[PDB]
Amino acid sequence: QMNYEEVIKKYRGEENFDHAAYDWRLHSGVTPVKDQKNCGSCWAFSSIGSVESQYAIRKNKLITLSEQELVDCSFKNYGCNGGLINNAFEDMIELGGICPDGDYPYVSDAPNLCNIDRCTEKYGIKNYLSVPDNKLKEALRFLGPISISVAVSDDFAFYKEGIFDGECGDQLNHAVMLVGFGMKEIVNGEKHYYYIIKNSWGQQWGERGFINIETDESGLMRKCGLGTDAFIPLIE
Ligand SMILES: *[C@@H](C(=O)O)[C@H](O)C(=O)N[C@@H](CC(C)C)C(=O)NCCCCNC(N)=[NH2+]
């Protein structure tokens, strides 16, 4: 399954890198948010996001791929009744690529039947690695956006702009992407550090789909278990 410490060194080597801000959105590494509507398929969106990013980052190609197919075909998961990020990545490999949603469009909880050969060209992930929770900003900076868990709550839903510092979920309950991190200074001077999350609740939600959760310079601070689970697909 490839351990992180051997993967990380091939893509970093050295730098040294800045822990204040890096935003993939701004450097052609995050494809637009989507909306899972009603249909418990975050795991599907969180997973396929990270792969869309890698095709963006590591080979130019903008491609958006079908989380429906993944909802229809990932038998290590439970379609709209839930799923897991890893399981998803594995199911992708067994399926041997995913269709570009443009061919295999999303119909949320509307009953649908898997159809592998619904698109001549598929899009694969070679393998996937876990990112350790103590090394997220490091991972983002060199490896790319990260499919990750988080304990979402009501306060989290009413987010609209700025740095979230509200209340947290009961348990890890939702999937999202990490796409970056940043820091703004606001004088009461006080440097305020945050991670940028991409969500799957439509662009109407928060900052065109995204949300900024408070953190620290290191990025050891993880609000709402931010990435107690953390995976990134390798397509290289
Ligand atoms: C995520 C969402 O759309 O909110 C979706 O409910 C989901 O899959 N959530 C995960 C939470 C993790 C932190 C990603 C989840 O609950 N996974 C386990 C579901 C599998 C077991 N459930 C059933 N019904 N077999």
PDB file of all heavy atoms in Angstrom, residues 9-36:
ATOM      1  N   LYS A   9       9.684  11.473   0.240  1.00  0.00           N
ATOM      2  CA  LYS A   9      11.065  11.897  -0.059  1.00  0.00           C
ATOM      3  C   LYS A   9      11.370  12.029  -1.555  1.00  0.00           C
ATOM      4  O   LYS A   9      12.241  12.810  -1.940  1.00  0.00           O
ATOM      5  CB  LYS A   9      12.071  10.944   0.593  1.00  0.00           C
ATOM      6  CG  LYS A   9      12.116  11.036   2.108  1.00  0.00           C
ATOM      7  CD  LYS A   9      13.061  10.003   2.699  1.00  0.00           C
ATOM      8  CE  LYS A   9      13.116  10.102   4.215  1.00  0.00           C
ATOM      9  NZ  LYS A   9      14.036   9.093   4.809  1.00  0.00           N
ATOM     10  N   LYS A  10      10.664  11.266  -2.386  1.00  0.00           N
ATOM     11  CA  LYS A  10      10.822  11.352  -3.841  1.00  0.00           C
ATOM     12  C   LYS A  10      10.306  12.681  -4.398  1.00  0.00           C
ATOM     13  O   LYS A  10      10.858  13.211  -5.364  1.00  0.00           O
ATOM     14  CB  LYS A  10      10.094  10.194  -4.532  1.00  0.00           C
ATOM     15  CG  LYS A  10      10.701   8.827  -4.264  1.00  0.00           C
ATOM     16  CD  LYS A  10      10.002   7.745  -5.071  1.00  0.00           C
ATOM     17  CE  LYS A  10      10.661   6.390  -4.876  1.00  0.00           C
ATOM     18  NZ  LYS A  10       9.973   5.317  -5.647  1.00  0.00           N
ATOM     19  N   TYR A  11       9.247  13.207  -3.779  1.00  0.00           N
ATOM     20  CA  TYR A  11       8.582  14.432  -4.242  1.00  0.00           C
ATOM     21  C   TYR A  11       9.062  15.717  -3.549  1.00  0.00           C
ATOM     22  O   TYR A  11       8.869  16.812  -4.079  1.00  0.00           O
ATOM     23  CB  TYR A  11       7.066  14.295  -4.076  1.00  0.00           C
ATOM     24  CG  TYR A  11       6.395  13.521  -5.192  1.00  0.00           C
ATOM     25  CD1 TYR A  11       5.689  12.347  -4.933  1.00  0.00           C
ATOM     26  CD2 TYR A  11       6.450  13.979  -6.509  1.00  0.00           C
ATOM     27  CE1 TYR A  11       5.061  11.646  -5.960  1.00  0.00           C
ATOM     28  CE2 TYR A  11       5.831  13.285  -7.541  1.00  0.00           C
ATOM     29  CZ  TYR A  11       5.136  12.122  -7.262  1.00  0.00           C
ATOM     30  OH  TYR A  11       4.526  11.443  -8.291  1.00  0.00           O
ATOM     31  N   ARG A  12       9.665  15.578  -2.368  1.00  0.00           N
ATOM     32  CA  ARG A  12      10.222  16.715  -1.633  1.00  0.00           C
ATOM     33  C   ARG A  12      11.718  16.829  -1.885  1.00  0.00           C
ATOM     34  O   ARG A  12      12.185  17.813  -2.461  1.00  0.00           O
ATOM     35  CB  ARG A  12       9.961  16.582  -0.125  1.00  0.00           C
ATOM     36  CG  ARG A  12      10.721  17.604   0.737  1.00  0.00           C
ATOM     37  CD  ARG A  12      10.120  17.750   2.134  1.00  0.00           C
ATOM     38  NE  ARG A  12      10.593  18.963   2.812  1.00  0.00           N
ATOM     39  CZ  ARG A  12      10.186  19.369   4.017  1.00  0.00           C
ATOM     40  NH1 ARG A  12       9.291  18.663   4.706  1.00  0.00           N
ATOM     41  NH2 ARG A  12      10.680  20.490   4.539  1.00  0.00           N
ATOM     42  N   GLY A  13      12.467  15.817  -1.449  1.00  0.00           N
ATOM     43  CA  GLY A  13      13.922  15.891  -1.428  1.00  0.00           C
ATOM     44  C   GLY A  13      14.329  16.861  -0.339  1.00  0.00           C
ATOM     45  O   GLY A  13      14.778  16.448   0.731  1.00  0.00           O
ATOM     46  N   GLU A  14      14.170  18.152  -0.629  1.00  0.00           N
ATOM     47  CA  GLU A  14      14.312  19.232   0.355  1.00  0.00           C
ATOM     48  C   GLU A  14      13.337  20.376  -0.007  1.00  0.00           C
ATOM     49  O   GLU A  14      12.413  20.189  -0.805  1.00  0.00           O
ATOM     50  CB  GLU A  14      15.761  19.760   0.372  1.00  0.00           C
ATOM     51  CG  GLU A  14      16.827  18.777   0.859  1.00  0.00           C
ATOM     52  CD  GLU A  14      16.646  18.360   2.311  1.00  0.00           C
ATOM     53  OE1 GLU A  14      16.042  19.125   3.092  1.00  0.00           O
ATOM     54  OE2 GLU A  14      17.118  17.261   2.674  1.00  0.00           O
ATOM     55  N   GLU A  15      13.519  21.534   0.626  1.00  0.00           N
ATOM     56  CA  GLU A  15      13.150  22.824   0.025  1.00  0.00           C
ATOM     57  C   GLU A  15      13.995  23.985   0.620  1.00  0.00           C
ATOM     58  O   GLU A  15      14.982  24.377  -0.012  1.00  0.00           O
ATOM     59  CB  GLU A  15      11.631  23.089   0.043  1.00  0.00           C
ATOM     60  CG  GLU A  15      10.917  22.856  -1.296  1.00  0.00           C
ATOM     61  CD  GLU A  15      11.403  23.775  -2.408  1.00  0.00           C
ATOM     62  OE1 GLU A  15      11.929  24.869  -2.108  1.00  0.00           O
ATOM     63  OE2 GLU A  15      11.253  23.402  -3.591  1.00  0.00           O
ATOM     64  N   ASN A  16      13.690  24.521   1.811  1.00  0.00           N
ATOM     65  CA  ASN A  16      12.651  24.063   2.750  1.00  0.00           C
ATOM     66  C   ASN A  16      11.327  24.821   2.543  1.00  0.00           C
ATOM     67  O   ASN A  16      11.338  25.957   2.065  1.00  0.00           O
ATOM     68  CB  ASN A  16      13.161  24.286   4.180  1.00  0.00           C
ATOM     69  CG  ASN A  16      12.448  23.427   5.203  1.00  0.00           C
ATOM     70  OD1 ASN A  16      11.226  23.519   5.379  1.00  0.00           O
ATOM     71  ND2 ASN A  16      13.217  22.591   5.903  1.00  0.00           N
ATOM     72  N   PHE A  17      10.197  24.210   2.898  1.00  0.00           N
ATOM     73  CA  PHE A  17       8.886  24.767   2.525  1.00  0.00           C
ATOM     74  C   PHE A  17       8.229  25.636   3.599  1.00  0.00           C
ATOM     75  O   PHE A  17       8.451  25.451   4.795  1.00  0.00           O
ATOM     76  CB  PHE A  17       7.930  23.652   2.074  1.00  0.00           C
ATOM     77  CG  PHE A  17       7.060  23.090   3.171  1.00  0.00           C
ATOM     78  CD1 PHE A  17       5.810  23.632   3.426  1.00  0.00           C
ATOM     79  CD2 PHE A  17       7.480  22.008   3.922  1.00  0.00           C
ATOM     80  CE1 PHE A  17       5.004  23.114   4.424  1.00  0.00           C
ATOM     81  CE2 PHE A  17       6.676  21.483   4.918  1.00  0.00           C
ATOM     82  CZ  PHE A  17       5.437  22.036   5.169  1.00  0.00           C
ATOM     83  N   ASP A  18       7.386  26.558   3.138  1.00  0.00           N
ATOM     84  CA  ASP A  18       6.735  27.559   3.983  1.00  0.00           C
ATOM     85  C   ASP A  18       5.421  27.059   4.575  1.00  0.00           C
ATOM     86  O   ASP A  18       4.522  26.651   3.842  1.00  0.00           O
ATOM     87  CB  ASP A  18       6.464  28.819   3.155  1.00  0.00           C
ATOM     88  CG  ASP A  18       5.619  29.838   3.891  1.00  0.00           C
ATOM     89  OD1 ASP A  18       5.592  29.807   5.140  1.00  0.00           O
ATOM     90  OD2 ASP A  18       4.980  30.672   3.213  1.00  0.00           O
ATOM     91  N   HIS A  19       5.301  27.147   5.898  1.00  0.00           N
ATOM     92  CA  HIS A  19       4.150  26.602   6.629  1.00  0.00           C
ATOM     93  C   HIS A  19       3.019  27.605   6.824  1.00  0.00           C
ATOM     94  O   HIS A  19       2.061  27.322   7.543  1.00  0.00           O
ATOM     95  CB  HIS A  19       4.596  26.094   8.002  1.00  0.00           C
ATOM     96  CG  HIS A  19       5.432  24.858   7.942  1.00  0.00           C
ATOM     97  ND1 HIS A  19       6.682  24.833   7.362  1.00  0.00           N
ATOM     98  CD2 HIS A  19       5.200  23.604   8.395  1.00  0.00           C
ATOM     99  CE1 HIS A  19       7.182  23.615   7.458  1.00  0.00           C
ATOM    100  NE2 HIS A  19       6.303  22.850   8.081  1.00  0.00           N
ATOM    101  N   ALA A  20       3.131  28.772   6.196  1.00  0.00           N
ATOM    102  CA  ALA A  20       2.126  29.818   6.341  1.00  0.00           C
ATOM    103  C   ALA A  20       0.980  29.602   5.367  1.00  0.00           C
ATOM    104  O   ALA A  20      -0.178  29.566   5.768  1.00  0.00           O
ATOM    105  CB  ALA A  20       2.747  31.181   6.128  1.00  0.00           C
ATOM    106  N   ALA A  21       1.306  29.448   4.087  1.00  0.00           N
ATOM    107  CA  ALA A  21       0.286  29.381   3.047  1.00  0.00           C
ATOM    108  C   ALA A  21       0.729  28.621   1.815  1.00  0.00           C
ATOM    109  O   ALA A  21       1.778  28.896   1.247  1.00  0.00           O
ATOM    110  CB  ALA A  21      -0.137  30.779   2.640  1.00  0.00           C
ATOM    111  N   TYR A  22      -0.088  27.651   1.421  1.00  0.00           N
ATOM    112  CA  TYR A  22      -0.079  27.140   0.059  1.00  0.00           C
ATOM    113  C   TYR A  22      -1.501  26.764  -0.321  1.00  0.00           C
ATOM    114  O   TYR A  22      -2.198  26.090   0.440  1.00  0.00           O
ATOM    115  CB  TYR A  22       0.839  25.938  -0.100  1.00  0.00           C
ATOM    116  CG  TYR A  22       1.100  25.630  -1.551  1.00  0.00           C
ATOM    117  CD1 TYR A  22       2.086  26.305  -2.249  1.00  0.00           C
ATOM    118  CD2 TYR A  22       0.336  24.688  -2.237  1.00  0.00           C
ATOM    119  CE1 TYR A  22       2.321  26.048  -3.584  1.00  0.00           C
ATOM    120  CE2 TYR A  22       0.572  24.419  -3.578  1.00  0.00           C
ATOM    121  CZ  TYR A  22       1.566  25.107  -4.244  1.00  0.00           C
ATOM    122  OH  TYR A  22       1.812  24.855  -5.573  1.00  0.00           O
ATOM    123  N   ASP A  23      -1.917  27.213  -1.500  1.00  0.00           N
ATOM    124  CA  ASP A  23      -3.289  27.060  -1.962  1.00  0.00           C
ATOM    125  C   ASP A  23      -3.281  26.417  -3.349  1.00  0.00           C
ATOM    126  O   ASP A  23      -2.886  27.054  -4.332  1.00  0.00           O
ATOM    127  CB  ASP A  23      -3.951  28.437  -2.015  1.00  0.00           C
ATOM    128  CG  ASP A  23      -5.444  28.366  -2.238  1.00  0.00           C
ATOM    129  OD1 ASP A  23      -5.896  27.430  -2.929  1.00  0.00           O
ATOM    130  OD2 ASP A  23      -6.156  29.255  -1.723  1.00  0.00           O
ATOM    131  N   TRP A  24      -3.705  25.155  -3.424  1.00  0.00           N
ATOM    132  CA  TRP A  24      -3.697  24.429  -4.698  1.00  0.00           C
ATOM    133  C   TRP A  24      -4.691  25.007  -5.685  1.00  0.00           C
ATOM    134  O   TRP A  24      -4.422  25.010  -6.895  1.00  0.00           O
ATOM    135  CB  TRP A  24      -4.011  22.944  -4.504  1.00  0.00           C
ATOM    136  CG  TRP A  24      -2.831  22.114  -4.182  1.00  0.00           C
ATOM    137  CD1 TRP A  24      -2.636  21.361  -3.062  1.00  0.00           C
ATOM    138  CD2 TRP A  24      -1.670  21.937  -4.995  1.00  0.00           C
ATOM    139  NE1 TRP A  24      -1.417  20.728  -3.130  1.00  0.00           N
ATOM    140  CE2 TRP A  24      -0.805  21.068  -4.305  1.00  0.00           C
ATOM    141  CE3 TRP A  24      -1.275  22.439  -6.235  1.00  0.00           C
ATOM    142  CZ2 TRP A  24       0.421  20.687  -4.814  1.00  0.00           C
ATOM    143  CZ3 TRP A  24      -0.050  22.060  -6.740  1.00  0.00           C
ATOM    144  CH2 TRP A  24       0.780  21.192  -6.033  1.00  0.00           C
ATOM    145  N   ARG A  25      -5.833  25.481  -5.169  1.00  0.00           N
ATOM    146  CA  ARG A  25      -6.875  26.086  -6.000  1.00  0.00           C
ATOM    147  C   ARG A  25      -6.247  27.104  -6.944  1.00  0.00           C
ATOM    148  O   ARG A  25      -6.515  27.114  -8.147  1.00  0.00           O
ATOM    149  CB  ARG A  25      -7.932  26.787  -5.149  1.00  0.00           C
ATOM    150  CG  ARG A  25      -8.718  25.875  -4.223  1.00  0.00           C
ATOM    151  CD  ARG A  25      -9.731  26.640  -3.369  1.00  0.00           C
ATOM    152  NE  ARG A  25      -9.077  27.627  -2.517  1.00  0.00           N
ATOM    153  CZ  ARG A  25      -9.689  28.361  -1.595  1.00  0.00           C
ATOM    154  NH1 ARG A  25     -10.986  28.229  -1.366  1.00  0.00           N
ATOM    155  NH2 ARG A  25      -8.989  29.231  -0.884  1.00  0.00           N
ATOM    156  N   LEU A  26      -5.387  27.938  -6.368  1.00  0.00           N
ATOM    157  CA  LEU A  26      -4.773  29.041  -7.071  1.00  0.00           C
ATOM    158  C   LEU A  26      -3.727  28.585  -8.058  1.00  0.00           C
ATOM    159  O   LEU A  26      -3.425  29.323  -8.985  1.00  0.00           O
ATOM    160  CB  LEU A  26      -4.157  30.025  -6.075  1.00  0.00           C
ATOM    161  CG  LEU A  26      -5.196  30.705  -5.182  1.00  0.00           C
ATOM    162  CD1 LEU A  26      -4.585  31.210  -3.884  1.00  0.00           C
ATOM    163  CD2 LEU A  26      -5.880  31.822  -5.945  1.00  0.00           C
ATOM    164  N   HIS A  27      -3.166  27.389  -7.883  1.00  0.00           N
ATOM    165  CA  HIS A  27      -2.142  26.899  -8.829  1.00  0.00           C
ATOM    166  C   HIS A  27      -2.577  25.627  -9.575  1.00  0.00           C
ATOM    167  O   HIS A  27      -1.835  24.650  -9.659  1.00  0.00           O
ATOM    168  CB  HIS A  27      -0.793  26.723  -8.126  1.00  0.00           C
ATOM    169  CG  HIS A  27      -0.396  27.902  -7.295  1.00  0.00           C
ATOM    170  ND1 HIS A  27       0.061  29.078  -7.844  1.00  0.00           N
ATOM    171  CD2 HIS A  27      -0.412  28.097  -5.952  1.00  0.00           C
ATOM    172  CE1 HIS A  27       0.321  29.944  -6.878  1.00  0.00           C
ATOM    173  NE2 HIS A  27       0.040  29.374  -5.720  1.00  0.00           N
ATOM    174  N   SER A  28      -3.792  25.671 -10.115  1.00  0.00           N
ATOM    175  CA  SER A  28      -4.274  24.677 -11.065  1.00  0.00           C
ATOM    176  C   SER A  28      -4.253  23.245 -10.512  1.00  0.00           C
ATOM    177  O   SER A  28      -3.816  22.320 -11.190  1.00  0.00           O
ATOM    178  CB  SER A  28      -3.455  24.779 -12.359  1.00  0.00           C
ATOM    179  OG  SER A  28      -4.027  24.002 -13.394  1.00  0.00           O
ATOM    180  N   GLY A  29      -4.738  23.067  -9.286  1.00  0.00           N
ATOM    181  CA  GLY A  29      -4.717  21.752  -8.634  1.00  0.00           C
ATOM    182  C   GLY A  29      -6.014  21.281  -7.990  1.00  0.00           C
ATOM    183  O   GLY A  29      -6.067  20.194  -7.401  1.00  0.00           O
ATOM    184  N   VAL A  30      -7.062  22.089  -8.074  1.00  0.00           N
ATOM    185  CA  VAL A  30      -8.342  21.707  -7.501  1.00  0.00           C
ATOM    186  C   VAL A  30      -9.401  21.954  -8.564  1.00  0.00           C
ATOM    187  O   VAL A  30      -9.433  23.037  -9.166  1.00  0.00           O
ATOM    188  CB  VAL A  30      -8.642  22.508  -6.237  1.00  0.00           C
ATOM    189  CG1 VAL A  30      -9.972  22.066  -5.635  1.00  0.00           C
ATOM    190  CG2 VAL A  30      -7.517  22.346  -5.243  1.00  0.00           C
ATOM    191  N   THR A  31     -10.223  20.942  -8.842  1.00  0.00           N
ATOM    192  CA  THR A  31     -11.254  21.082  -9.862  1.00  0.00           C
ATOM    193  C   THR A  31     -12.498  21.453  -9.088  1.00  0.00           C
ATOM    194  O   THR A  31     -12.529  21.255  -7.881  1.00  0.00           O
ATOM    195  CB  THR A  31     -11.398  19.812 -10.756  1.00  0.00           C
ATOM    196  OG1 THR A  31     -11.758  18.677  -9.971  1.00  0.00           O
ATOM    197  CG2 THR A  31     -10.092  19.517 -11.445  1.00  0.00           C
ATOM    198  N   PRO A  32     -13.503  22.032  -9.759  1.00  0.00           N
ATOM    199  CA  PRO A  32     -14.622  22.673  -9.082  1.00  0.00           C
ATOM    200  C   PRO A  32     -15.307  21.765  -8.101  1.00  0.00           C
ATOM    201  O   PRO A  32     -15.246  20.550  -8.259  1.00  0.00           O
ATOM    202  CB  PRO A  32     -15.578  22.984 -10.220  1.00  0.00           C
ATOM    203  CG  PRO A  32     -14.714  23.123 -11.406  1.00  0.00           C
ATOM    204  CD  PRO A  32     -13.635  22.121 -11.221  1.00  0.00           C
ATOM    205  N   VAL A  33     -15.974  22.339  -7.105  1.00  0.00           N
ATOM    206  CA  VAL A  33     -16.723  21.517  -6.170  1.00  0.00           C
ATOM    207  C   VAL A  33     -17.963  20.989  -6.880  1.00  0.00           C
ATOM    208  O   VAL A  33     -18.376  21.505  -7.917  1.00  0.00           O
ATOM    209  CB  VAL A  33     -17.135  22.267  -4.865  1.00  0.00           C
ATOM    210  CG1 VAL A  33     -16.113  23.349  -4.489  1.00  0.00           C
ATOM    211  CG2 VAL A  33     -18.552  22.844  -4.970  1.00  0.00           C
ATOM    212  N   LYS A  34     -18.527  19.939  -6.312  1.00  0.00           N
ATOM    213  CA  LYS A  34     -19.757  19.336  -6.764  1.00  0.00           C
ATOM    214  C   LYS A  34     -20.732  19.275  -5.575  1.00  0.00           C
ATOM    215  O   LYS A  34     -20.404  19.676  -4.444  1.00  0.00           O
ATOM    216  CB  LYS A  34     -19.474  17.920  -7.246  1.00  0.00           C
ATOM    217  CG  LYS A  34     -18.436  17.806  -8.304  1.00  0.00           C
ATOM    218  CD  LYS A  34     -18.128  16.341  -8.593  1.00  0.00           C
ATOM    219  CE  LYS A  34     -17.218  16.160  -9.831  1.00  0.00           C
ATOM    220  NZ  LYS A  34     -16.464  14.868  -9.819  1.00  0.00           N
ATOM    221  N   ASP A  35     -21.918  18.733  -5.819  1.00  0.00           N
ATOM    222  CA  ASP A  35     -22.965  18.683  -4.805  1.00  0.00           C
ATOM    223  C   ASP A  35     -23.531  17.265  -4.738  1.00  0.00           C
ATOM    224  O   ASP A  35     -24.193  16.809  -5.659  1.00  0.00           O
ATOM    225  CB  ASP A  35     -24.045  19.692  -5.199  1.00  0.00           C
ATOM    226  CG  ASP A  35     -25.145  19.807  -4.195  1.00  0.00           C
ATOM    227  OD1 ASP A  35     -25.250  18.937  -3.318  1.00  0.00           O
ATOM    228  OD2 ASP A  35     -25.919  20.775  -4.300  1.00  0.00           O
ATOM    229  N   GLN A  36     -23.278  16.559  -3.654  1.00  0.00           N
ATOM    230  CA  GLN A  36     -23.806  15.218  -3.527  1.00  0.00           C
ATOM    231  C   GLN A  36     -25.335  15.230  -3.296  1.00  0.00           C
ATOM    232  O   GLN A  36     -25.979  14.169  -3.180  1.00  0.00           O
ATOM    233  CB  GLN A  36     -23.086  14.491  -2.385  1.00  0.00           C
ATOM    234  CG  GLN A  36     -23.571  14.859  -1.007  1.00  0.00           C
ATOM    235  CD  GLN A  36     -22.499  14.733   0.024  1.00  0.00           C
ATOM    236  OE1 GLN A  36     -21.525  15.471  -0.010  1.00  0.00           O
ATOM    237  NE2 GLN A  36     -22.679  13.815   0.977  1.00  0.00           N
TER     238      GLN A  36
END
